[PDB]
Amino acid sequence: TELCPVYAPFFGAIGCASAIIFTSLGAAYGTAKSGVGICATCVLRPDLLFKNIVPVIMAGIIAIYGLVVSVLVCYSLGQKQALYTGFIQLGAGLSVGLSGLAAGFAIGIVGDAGVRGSSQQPRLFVGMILILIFAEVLGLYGLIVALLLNSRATQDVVC
Amino acid sequence: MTELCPVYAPFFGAIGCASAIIFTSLGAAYGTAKSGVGICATCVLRPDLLFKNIVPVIMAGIIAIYGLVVSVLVCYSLGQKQALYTGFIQLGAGLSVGLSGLAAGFAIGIVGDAGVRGSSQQPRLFVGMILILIFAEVLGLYGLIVALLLNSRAT
Amino acid sequence: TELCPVYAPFFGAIGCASAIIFTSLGAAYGTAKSGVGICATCVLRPDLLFKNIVPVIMAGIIAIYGLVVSVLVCYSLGQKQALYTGFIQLGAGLSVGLSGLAAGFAIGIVGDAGVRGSSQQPRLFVGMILILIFAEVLGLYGLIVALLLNSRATQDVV
Amino acid sequence: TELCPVYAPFFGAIGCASAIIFTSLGAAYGTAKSGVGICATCVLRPDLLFKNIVPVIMAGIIAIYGLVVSVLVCYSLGQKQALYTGFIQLGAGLSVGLSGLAAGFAIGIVGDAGVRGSSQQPRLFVGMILILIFAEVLGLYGLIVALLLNSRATQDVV
Amino acid sequence: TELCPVYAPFFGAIGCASAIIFTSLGAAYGTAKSGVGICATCVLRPDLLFKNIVPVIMAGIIAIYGLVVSVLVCYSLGQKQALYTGFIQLGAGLSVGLSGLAAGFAIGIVGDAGVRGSSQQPRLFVGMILILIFAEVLGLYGLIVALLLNSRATQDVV
Amino acid sequence: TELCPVYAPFFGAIGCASAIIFTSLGAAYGTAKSGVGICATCVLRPDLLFKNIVPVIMAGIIAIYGLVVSVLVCYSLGQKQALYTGFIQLGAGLSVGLSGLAAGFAIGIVGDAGVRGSSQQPRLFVGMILILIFAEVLGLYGLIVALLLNSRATQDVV
Amino acid sequence: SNIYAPLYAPFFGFAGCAAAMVLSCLGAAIGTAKSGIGIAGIGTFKPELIMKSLIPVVMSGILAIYGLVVAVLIAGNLSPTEDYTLFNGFMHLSCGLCVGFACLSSGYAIGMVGDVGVRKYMHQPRLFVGIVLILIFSEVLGLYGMIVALILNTRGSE
Amino acid sequence: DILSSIWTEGLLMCLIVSALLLFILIVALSWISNLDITYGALEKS
Amino acid sequence: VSTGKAWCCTVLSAFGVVILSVIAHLFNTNHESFVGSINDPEDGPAVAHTVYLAALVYLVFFVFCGFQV
Amino acid sequence: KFSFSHFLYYLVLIVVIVYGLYKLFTGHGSDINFGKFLLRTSPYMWANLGIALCVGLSVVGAAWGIFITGSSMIGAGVRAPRITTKNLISIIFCEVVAIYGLIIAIVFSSKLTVATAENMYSKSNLYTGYSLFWAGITVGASNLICGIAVGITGATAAISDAADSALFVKILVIEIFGSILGLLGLIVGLLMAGKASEFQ
Amino acid sequence: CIPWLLLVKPLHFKFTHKGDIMIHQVIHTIEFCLNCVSHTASYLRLWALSLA
Amino acid sequence: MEGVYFNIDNGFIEGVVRGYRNGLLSNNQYINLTQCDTLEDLKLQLSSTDYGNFLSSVSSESLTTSLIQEYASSKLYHEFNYIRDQSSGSTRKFMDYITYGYMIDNVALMITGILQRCHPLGWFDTLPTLSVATDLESLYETVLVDTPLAPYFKNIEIIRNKLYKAYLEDFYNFVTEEIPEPAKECMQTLLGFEADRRSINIALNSLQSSDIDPDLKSDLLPNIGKLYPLATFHLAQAQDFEGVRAALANVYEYRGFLETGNLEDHFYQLEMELCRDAFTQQFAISTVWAWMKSKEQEVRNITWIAECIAQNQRERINNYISVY
Amino acid sequence: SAMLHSLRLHWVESMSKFFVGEGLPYEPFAFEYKDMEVAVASASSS
Amino acid sequence: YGIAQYREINAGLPTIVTFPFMFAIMFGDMGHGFLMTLAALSLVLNEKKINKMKRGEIFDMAFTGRYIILLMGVFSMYTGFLYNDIFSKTMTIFKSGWKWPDHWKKGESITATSVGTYPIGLDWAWHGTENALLFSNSYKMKLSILMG
Amino acid sequence: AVINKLMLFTAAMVVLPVLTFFIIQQFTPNTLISGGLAAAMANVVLIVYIVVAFRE
């Protein structure tokens, strides 16, 4: 029907793709930036390796958010799914993906700066963690929005 | 479908819901990254100023909180057969809050970096920092207000 | 057929293309960015050559994921396939391809730093391995999403 | 009608706009690049109240060309104007506008060179006005083209 | 009528405009960069306005070619002209305009370099004028092509 | 008629324009680069003008290739010309134009380097000539392609 | 109802309003900020001559005054219940473009002249009349644009 | 009365608003990519 | 065990007891602000009972942490 | 010379030119029918884009001026923290710019009403859609321009005040001119939307 | 009230002191008139923060 | 425009730099230091200025002109390293290039082998190796290849001036490419002055050596600035001081300012003019260069006054160079 | 946020109506417990 | 902001009330005002213990503003009472001035009728209504203009 | 010690959120709480890691 056109699953499939793609881009940026920071610092301060690898963990959190939303959108995909469902899946994918991309950029920059700083000043570690959490909640918010959208993707939907 | 409620009407609502959180989150990410670079540079010398210098990243975070609020509010106004009127209401709310919070987050990041640096060199600059930074936050706040006003008219 | 238009296999074919193209591009960045670091590392201390080749292998694994997805979606292609399965094969291809592109980007950068660091400090080897794993699981997640999409591609499809 | 569509005055209005836009841009560039370049000996400039005006005069003349063509096409515009008349007014506007923009760029660069390279020798300030005339006559050519074309705008038109 | 559509004079007017627009841009570059080069004659007065100004006169002659072609194509323009006339006239305008733009770029570059060199050592002048002739002949070719096109713009038109 | 449409001469006029335009820009670049080289060198050695104005001549030669193709295309333009001959005239125009643009880049760069080197080492003169011959036969290839293509423009046209 | 007054004409009317005001604001802000940069350093804190220091920002504000005048005149001819024609829509759009771009050019030239101007004549009062004359030639550009806008207002809204 | 069977007004304005959002996104990502780190205050003393 | 955590959890659990007790009372009395909407839980006292149990859980936490204050 | 952004600019320019020539030559030039695009398109897209861009560009200008002048005054405040409260009027006038956008967004939101399908695309509804769209763009873009200008001027004022307190006073006049620019933009937006009826 | 503000205070100085404060008075009164509007606008942040 | 994007990264930096510019000693403060009668009195009077309590740890008996110079230079270097630490991207590279000049100075001073680094801003990890690098053949391929001076390299005065030629040319290119318009023009003019000073000094050094071929100076004269190429070529062909005068007769600036008076005083005076002019641009990173040069001249003046009150000879106390 | 905005209303909207300002701080000559943490001052403040 | 001119009116004396109460108008919640009041009282009641004690900087800032924060909390409780807000929820301590229709079907878009006016504070009948934002915005915007 | 337990933490972060996600997805059709549990597991692993990092 017109409520469920044949191009409706395009938006859902590309939202599924975009969730994991952009969250993986954010997690990759965070991992790479904080990882060059860690590799630069741990040459002189090897024992800090356990502590200063936290921003990589936080980027991995963004990647897990993207995985979760992508899998939810995947199981919500259908051949005769509504066009509304397509837009909602696209919105959830873009929300989680781009919010996690922003969170990953923030995590990468803050993790690099804070790892290199804390290699000098141990007390800076708590500040680094607090800022990284404030950066990670951005991806958490993106996840929350994506989850709410995907929950509403098929509620009261007719074909 | 109907002339008032086209099948493509929910596209604007969903994309506005996405836009709110996305652009507010990029604004918050820029603010958090810039101010966190400032904090980490500053607190190598003077870690005692951590809980002062933490303010700009916190304000960046509240920008994303405003975005989350708007995204949730427009999300629960979405429907398959929703009107095109409410679709563009949701689009306008999401776009307003997203762009406003994006600009506010950029301003917060830059001002917070400069402020933490200065208030580490000059402690009397803390009140100045924070009072400029609240003035940057209030712009994302204004975008939130417009998004709320628009969303009040969704259906 | 409305549900199976003649242009439906276009999305499947370009999804099969992208799945390898972008994973191989990410693996290329990873292998090059890490390889220059390995070369600049072993010029001073060649004895750690086979210890420093790890990021190159981790980057190649990304292209392996892309190859896997490309093969599966390639065998999922048909002339009269639905437009739905075309969109979802495109989604799987883009998922794995761009997730592996991000993974290869991260692996290349952090391995470029890490081979140098490990040569200068052997204890940093395990740290570099850890960050490489956290970068590689990005491509692994892209693979998981692509595999789930591909399994969904031709189930309950008219 | 076919010859005189409702959207016919669009091209005339765009020609009128361009006649002002591009000539004013050229004149502004000439005036800015000239008046802001005066330095060195021109910082003192005791012998006269003004020594860098001629490039500004010629930029203003370019702007006057734009004004003249724009006013003429204003008074040539109409509601039931022919589409041909719209194209002619657009062509005249673009001619005068972009030719005057080129002339303004030339005048600005030549004046910047002349005043930046200020010297006590009279040679430059008595001879570079010839180069300035060669720059301004480009806008004069644009004006001639615009005036002729506009004179043809409503000639043998039905 | 299909052979003479109402949008046919659009291409003719755009050709007329371009013939003076692009040619004047070329002449503007040639005059401006040559003039800033001639500013090296701030020391040597007897070359300023006597021999060093050859490049700017050649740029002006380029603009003369552009004016000639623009006027010629303007007087062949008409409301009910053929679309073939529009294409031929746009082709003439673009030919002369962009060939004059190229010639003006070459004239400006070579004139700046040669005027500075001749201000350093005068014997370069005879070579400079020859190279400038080669540069200007490009615009002369553009003039020839545009004139031939305009000559056949209304030859066998119905 | 569908195979001789009204818009067919558009491609012919654009081919005629391009044939001179792109070759004139190529020649302009060649003559500009070479002229800079000559005007730099001839100051220090004012007798090698005839030995170093060779690449300028070759740039002029690719320009006359463009002129030839433009005039031959121009004499093939007609109001009721086929769309086929329009595409072939456009193809010949591009074939001579962009290949002569590449030849002009090559001639300009090679002539610049060889002029600045030949003054320092006269033995380089014949080598520079040889390289310029390659870079100019480079545009001669485009001329040959354009001539063969244009000869086929009206061969079997209905 | 009326082919000459389609319902989308107010789009172009309000576009004329925006092009007037936004671009006049661009001109006024460029002029005011750029000149203020100069004014901040010049002046030596002398109170009585501040009114001569502030001339460039006054002229820059006058540009915005022109923009406001034109936007108000356009908006006063816009109403949902009136028979607003498409011709009037294009006329108002051209009003906006003309005045906005003329004021933008005027603001650019006012700022670029006025910063160095105030830095000069505030310390060299001899150059006052010269700098002011240049600023006047800079401001008449916006005056020309406003004149064109006024003429297009009277003709379009007939 | 339709402007296009493919480029329908609904699709066209969906594209327009998505392009506006994408333009704002590209500007935001440009600014965020301009985030260099002031290493000197926090690198190697 | 530590005084800081003891005080933090004591204060949080005191607010828990008070706020969840008043919420449970308002659900138990079918107050409109908590039950008047179609989107609210349909049976006031039922959710009131579980909110009351949560208030008792925070009571346990409050009394325990007081024993470590 | 190459850049990806300019490459896409030239690519889309070429594509649009080729498409226009294809439509025009085949006699289908009227298929590119921007007027019918304006007629068919929903007035609410125009209205809500007007409001959203009004407030968004007002906030962008306010924030842009704010971080310009705030960063400058914090840097200048390192030696002279007295500069903060003295030059804070610059931050104030930057914020007032966004407040203008907020006010205009409120006024325009007063116009948003559910128009009947039978009256959806009437003269009045199209007029008010275009009016709110372009008035919001006018106010937002003027506010962006004025916020950037006021921020630049206030940064210069803060730095000059750091140099000497006597130089501050006359730059505040420049800031006043910058604020008057935004006020004029607001009043012109009000005039543009003044006679635009609600959606009916 | 605008001419009143501009004139009355400076002209008293000009006549009775036995004007130099014209510039200060004119800038002060223009900023006062504009600050009245901008302050009435800025007090909307009470509602803004309350609603947020 | 200038300031639209400038304050994203450099707004704090540029504000702090002109804050330091306000802290430069005025002519009145130089006069007050001149009227002092002892090093402790100068310490107190200078503490009354923006230097503050920097010698606060130094007693009057330990206080010497060398300590005053070292502390003033240390304060300048700490301020510069603060600004550089707070810098990123283009401005960070600009400041690194500023440091490369002191790096070249340190290279030339240390290869003389005692000569230490003697300049904190020119320090690099392998700099002290240059004290022990007697073999000039091993210089690049052993020591300098690791340093940022590697792109520049290709008796010691020849090496120093070749490094300066390459460095100044590369930094002019960097200024042209990566620096916005007002700062671009200001830095290009400042580099023109710096290359003119280098060319004039190198020509006057070649005046004392018979082996200074005109083509040899082509590896040595930067050919940048108003003297380029013409006056630079004339200096290359110049054989003696008369040749230098004839070469400089062909330019507006720096004409008649080497035929009379002290040449160093004239170069420093013109440098202060250019730095004062560069401070007028409001959103330009050239303010950093102007600040650096102004502070260096300030430290020179302070050390000069310290000498004139530690060894008396107060007739020379007023010959310091200042525009502030 | 609310307290900083009320500070805005007072410094800007309320006091600018009447506050002449630019007075002279009282800060009399009085002895105080100058703790030895002032060793940071005069040694790390310049 | 700045030190007052000699023997001009001190702004701090009006500020004592106006600053906390503008803060309250913007803040305006009884739950959050109550939390702020408790936080301030933890400093005011123990005032003698935190005095003559080292306080750092942030905790010192909290202590020096303890009466500022106390007045913020109290006026915020009053404002939230007028806003009828305790956290998200509304108080129902007086009879509403709005009475709903006698009967309605589930899901019907009913409208209340003005039986009277609510004595002090916003009427709790506005809680959860879909047009609550219109009335609340009108009220708070006009309140802002009037009180400013 | 760190070489092994940090391997445990990387394995936990890679695996446990995903396993919790799929197990909850299998047991419950409600997507919202499934994603909530997955994110909760990820953040709990993160919090435990931060706690042990502070303990050092």
PDB file of N, CA and C in Angstrom, chain H residues 1-2 9 11 14 16-17 19-20 25-30 33 35 40:
ATOM      1  N   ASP H   1      -1.049  19.418 -12.723  1.00  0.00           N
ATOM      2  CA  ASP H   1      -0.809  20.260 -11.557  1.00  0.00           C
ATOM      3  C   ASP H   1       0.416  19.821 -10.768  1.00  0.00           C
ATOM      4  N   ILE H   2       0.816  18.552 -10.881  1.00  0.00           N
ATOM      5  CA  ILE H   2       2.023  18.090 -10.211  1.00  0.00           C
ATOM      6  C   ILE H   2       3.249  18.666 -10.909  1.00  0.00           C
ATOM      7  N   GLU H   9       6.626  17.198  -4.719  1.00  0.00           N
ATOM      8  CA  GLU H   9       6.891  18.280  -3.777  1.00  0.00           C
ATOM      9  C   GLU H   9       7.294  17.742  -2.411  1.00  0.00           C
ATOM     10  N   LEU H  11       8.856  14.765  -1.658  1.00  0.00           N
ATOM     11  CA  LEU H  11      10.238  14.309  -1.760  1.00  0.00           C
ATOM     12  C   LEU H  11      11.194  15.484  -1.895  1.00  0.00           C
ATOM     13  N   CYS H  14      11.541  17.188   1.487  1.00  0.00           N
ATOM     14  CA  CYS H  14      12.320  16.293   2.338  1.00  0.00           C
ATOM     15  C   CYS H  14      13.803  16.404   2.010  1.00  0.00           C
ATOM     16  N   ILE H  16      15.246  18.976   0.608  1.00  0.00           N
ATOM     17  CA  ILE H  16      15.704  20.320   0.962  1.00  0.00           C
ATOM     18  C   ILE H  16      16.029  20.408   2.451  1.00  0.00           C
ATOM     19  N   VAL H  17      15.126  19.920   3.305  1.00  0.00           N
ATOM     20  CA  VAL H  17      15.366  20.011   4.743  1.00  0.00           C
ATOM     21  C   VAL H  17      16.506  19.086   5.163  1.00  0.00           C
ATOM     22  N   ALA H  19      19.050  18.372   3.284  1.00  0.00           N
ATOM     23  CA  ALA H  19      20.258  19.048   2.831  1.00  0.00           C
ATOM     24  C   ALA H  19      20.622  20.213   3.737  1.00  0.00           C
ATOM     25  N   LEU H  20      19.631  20.936   4.259  1.00  0.00           N
ATOM     26  CA  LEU H  20      19.917  21.980   5.240  1.00  0.00           C
ATOM     27  C   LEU H  20      20.542  21.386   6.498  1.00  0.00           C
ATOM     28  N   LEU H  25      25.373  20.023   9.611  1.00  0.00           N
ATOM     29  CA  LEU H  25      26.199  18.932  10.114  1.00  0.00           C
ATOM     30  C   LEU H  25      27.624  19.019   9.584  1.00  0.00           C
ATOM     31  N   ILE H  26      27.782  19.338   8.298  1.00  0.00           N
ATOM     32  CA  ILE H  26      29.112  19.448   7.707  1.00  0.00           C
ATOM     33  C   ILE H  26      29.875  20.608   8.328  1.00  0.00           C
ATOM     34  N   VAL H  27      29.197  21.735   8.559  1.00  0.00           N
ATOM     35  CA  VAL H  27      29.853  22.860   9.224  1.00  0.00           C
ATOM     36  C   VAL H  27      30.273  22.474  10.640  1.00  0.00           C
ATOM     37  N   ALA H  28      29.380  21.803  11.373  1.00  0.00           N
ATOM     38  CA  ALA H  28      29.698  21.371  12.729  1.00  0.00           C
ATOM     39  C   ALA H  28      30.891  20.425  12.740  1.00  0.00           C
ATOM     40  N   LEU H  29      30.915  19.470  11.807  1.00  0.00           N
ATOM     41  CA  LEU H  29      32.010  18.512  11.753  1.00  0.00           C
ATOM     42  C   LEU H  29      33.312  19.171  11.325  1.00  0.00           C
ATOM     43  N   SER H  30      33.247  20.198  10.475  1.00  0.00           N
ATOM     44  CA  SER H  30      34.449  20.953  10.138  1.00  0.00           C
ATOM     45  C   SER H  30      35.023  21.634  11.374  1.00  0.00           C
ATOM     46  N   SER H  33      36.478  19.013  13.671  1.00  0.00           N
ATOM     47  CA  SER H  33      37.741  18.505  13.157  1.00  0.00           C
ATOM     48  C   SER H  33      38.859  19.528  13.287  1.00  0.00           C
ATOM     49  N   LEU H  35      39.601  20.856  15.933  1.00  0.00           N
ATOM     50  CA  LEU H  35      40.013  20.771  17.336  1.00  0.00           C
ATOM     51  C   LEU H  35      41.402  20.145  17.433  1.00  0.00           C
ATOM     52  N   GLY H  40      51.692  21.436  24.276  1.00  0.00           N
ATOM     53  CA  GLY H  40      52.837  21.948  25.013  1.00  0.00           C
ATOM     54  C   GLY H  40      52.600  22.092  26.504  1.00  0.00           C
TER      55      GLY H  40
END
